[PDB]
Amino acid sequence: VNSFSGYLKLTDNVYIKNADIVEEAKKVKPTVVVNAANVYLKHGGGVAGALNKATNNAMQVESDDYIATNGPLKVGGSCVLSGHNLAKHCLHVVGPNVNKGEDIQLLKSAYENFNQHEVLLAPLLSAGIFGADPIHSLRVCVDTVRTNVYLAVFDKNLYDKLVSSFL
Numbered sequence: 687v688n689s690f691s692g693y694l695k696l697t698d699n700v701y702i703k704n705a706d707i708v709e710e711a712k713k714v715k716p717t718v719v720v721n722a723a724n725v726y727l728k729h730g731g732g733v734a735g736a737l738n739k740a741t742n743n744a745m746q747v748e749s750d751d752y753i754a755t756n757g758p759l760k761v762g763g764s765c766v767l768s769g770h771n772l773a774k775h776c777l778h779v780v781g782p783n784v785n786k787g788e789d790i791q792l793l794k795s796a797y798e799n800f801n802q803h804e805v806l807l808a809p810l811l812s813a814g815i816f817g818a819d820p821i822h823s824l825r826v827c828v829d830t831v832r833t834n835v836y837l838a839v840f841d842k843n844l845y846d847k848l849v850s851s852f853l
């Protein structure tokens with residue numbers, strides 16, 4: 687039993703809710719919140735900008751030190767950093783950005799990072815400003831992630847489209 691509330695069960699291990707990931711995190715304080723990161727951990731907009739703003743820029747400060755030490759992530763890769771006031775840990779995962787021409791096949795590699803964590807609160811990778819089709823992202827999630835994932839979708843219209851088209 688866990689404290690995630692109000693989710694639709696899609697499969698044995700994937701759940702989805704019409705919800706704000708920052709509010710979910712503030713409420714649940716999950717062990718892991720996933721960020722929709724880029725390779726430079728520059729949290730300017732989208733989910734990343736929202737998560738970072740909610741940490742009062744502490745996520746960005748920590749991320750800048752990470753990059754200065756380690757260099758950029760790979761597309762499809764991840765790193766574990768602090769979750770600050772939102773979660774124990776933040777798993778920064780880089781999905782391909784279609785607006786940068788990146789290969790959508792890398793979306794599966796991106797979701798594989800979730801399997802290193804037993805339970806996660808997450809957005810749909812490569813959705814929104816990353817340019818991919820969120821219906822496709824949800825399908826790859828369900829077909830790749832085997833651990834327990836709680837997906838938070840910002841927009842009622844999108845949430846209803848995802849549910850009503852889910853096979």
Ligand SMILES: N#Cc1ccc(OCCn2cnc(N)c3ncnc2-3)cc1
Pocket residue numbers: 705706707708732733736737809814838839840841
């Ligand atoms: N009109 C409209 C509209 C406004 C924001 C919006 O956010 C999508 C990405 N996103 C950003 N910030 C958050 N805290 C999120 N939680 C889940 N997804 C999140 C989508 C549609």
